[PDB]
Design a protein around this ligand. Sequence first.
Ligand SMILES: Cc1ccc(Cn2cc(C(N)=O)ccc2=O)c(C)c1
Ligand SMILES: Cc1ccc(Cn2cc(C(N)=O)ccc2=O)c(C)c1
Ligand SMILES: COc1ccc(O)c2nc(C)c(C)nc12
Ligand SMILES: COc1ccc(O)c2nc(C)c(C)nc12
Lengths: 318, 318
Amino acid sequence: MTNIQTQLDNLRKTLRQYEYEYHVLDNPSVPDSEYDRLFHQLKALELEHPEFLTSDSPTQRVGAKPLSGFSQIRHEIPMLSLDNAFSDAEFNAFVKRIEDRLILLPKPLTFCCEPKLDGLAVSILYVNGELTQAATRGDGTTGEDITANIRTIRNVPLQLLTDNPPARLEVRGEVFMPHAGFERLNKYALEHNEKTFANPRNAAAGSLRQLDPNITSKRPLVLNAYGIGIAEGVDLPTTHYARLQWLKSIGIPVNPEIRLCNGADEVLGFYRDIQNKRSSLGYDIDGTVLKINDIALQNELGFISKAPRWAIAYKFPA
Amino acid sequence: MTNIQTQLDNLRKTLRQYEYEYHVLDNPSVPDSEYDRLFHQLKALELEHPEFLTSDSPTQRVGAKPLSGFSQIRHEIPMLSLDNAFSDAEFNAFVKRIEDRLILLPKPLTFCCEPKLDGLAVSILYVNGELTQAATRGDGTTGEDITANIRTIRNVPLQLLTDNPPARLEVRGEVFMPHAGFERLNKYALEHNEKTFANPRNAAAGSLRQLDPNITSKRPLVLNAYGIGIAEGVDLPTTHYARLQWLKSIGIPVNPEIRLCNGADEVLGFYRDIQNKRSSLGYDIDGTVLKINDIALQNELGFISKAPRWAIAYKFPA
Ligand SMILES: Cc1ccc(Cn2cc(C(N)=O)ccc2=O)c(C)c1
Ligand SMILES: Cc1ccc(Cn2cc(C(N)=O)ccc2=O)c(C)c1
Ligand SMILES: COc1ccc(O)c2nc(C)c(C)nc12
Ligand SMILES: COc1ccc(O)c2nc(C)c(C)nc12
């Protein structure tokens, strides 16, 4: 044991706690100046004592050497697409189809309702708590290595916030750029002759495709986790909301506007409440993503492969 | 010009006409003995005058040398999957979802209704009328070269029945084995010590995976074309039924039980009529495949990629 290895560990633990509070809780216990005082106190010391520097330290978010092309990554568990509804009557028909397709319909049919961010789908792996690999969605089967670019996102933890993290946990989420960040960026490109971005979706996509993390660092990107992929060494809850609540408690950013709605009548109330809030969110939203909250019912219903909406195989019973 | 090149052309034209009548029309103009008389009259002569032998002659269906492993084939146009319904109430919900999803709902909503064969999905290419390539469905993106095995199917034309065939036409269909053929096959395996087949679906799959066409030739397989892929040099009709009627007129086998039904009430009548006929068809059927007959409405509705049945992105209007 030494006083400096004790100081480094203390600073790291504090700075991660301050980052959880600022980014995930939206409730920092200290001013930004305090957070920064300790940030460069740590950074200075790691450089004065290189032997005690760790790859997941809050000061090592940015890789100094720019990359020379992205590498392909075959996703273990596939990244699926989403079905879409464009009306109250169309949404109610999708529910009635599930109501019959199920073996037993519970009296309250609970749904985890969330806003649909206009963002880029990614998959982030965490091995024994620390971030080792990040990748784009791509076609769903294959994507690209955006690890050094995901590492630069201030609200993405480099280390999960738990003493017993799982063996391997894949966090699935959408990268996006909020309005303030988007407006600040286009002023800078205008003040320093360079291309401006059309809308926040394109700025985020363009920032993620950068091969120099130092550019990405300057881009004001943000993550919001929507699901889970690989889950080794853990017993994930039996509802989607609770799995989301669980990610929030281990250090991952999740959208605060997520709610549970019992049946289509309540779900339509949520869709309407978010449609009026569109004007005061601080980020873009295409709509609402609605999901069957019970995971057993999700595994009962299942998926549907690339297939027409104009054809159906109405099968016979035994 | 010579009398023998004139004889060969005449025999080929006649034998193809007799095959259309026997296999596609189910109405042969002559007895099987007449068809066979001419078959080996042609075969004998092609062998007495090898120089005038063609690769698409009715006598060259079977390749004499067995293959040494199948080659992979990347499908140009993808081969999609099918959605499924398990009840009257579930089917009506799928219709109501289409009724709203469309911009304009026609008064009569016509559907091309057909029986669902329990068969193996294939893709057959015809270049300037003659059969050049056949392939399995596989994952949808990639399949296997079963050209020499498809060539052996008595009801699959080696040459389209038209003086102006299209540039490239991909016929999409299901290979299956009828009951008589299936019962005759298992008696032969029992009488000559070999594995029997569980049901017609497995016998057909096992026959298609043979690398020696001579085995496939002996297996009593059959094709029924359900759709079209590549379509160069032709203006395909604006309805699914008419495209099917068109395949029937150029020499391809299509199921005779296919009918047009106006609206869900009539479609349910068809589903019921086929459910009672199950007992007297002479081949297996899992159910009924129902399709929106108008091709414009098909291109309006579109497809849906690998995606959950338990989730939906209810988007906002402009
Ligand atoms: C100078 C400076 C330092 C830090 C921040 C934001 N911030 C604050 C905290 C905090 N308050 O605990 C934690 C992480 C973080 O990213 C800004 C905007 C500017
Ligand atoms: C001996 C023999 C010859 C032909 C057939 C069946 N058949 C008949 C015709 C025909 N009638 O025009 C055309 C093609 C064909 O496949 C069988 C069952 C047995
Ligand atoms: C970018 O795509 C999405 C966004 C938000 C979601 O909740 C998603 N939920 C699921 C299940 C899937 C496949 N995609 C999602
Ligand atoms: C073996 O799969 C099928 C069988 C019958 C059909 O009509 C099909 N119709 C379509 C459009 C598709 C994608 N698959 C089909």
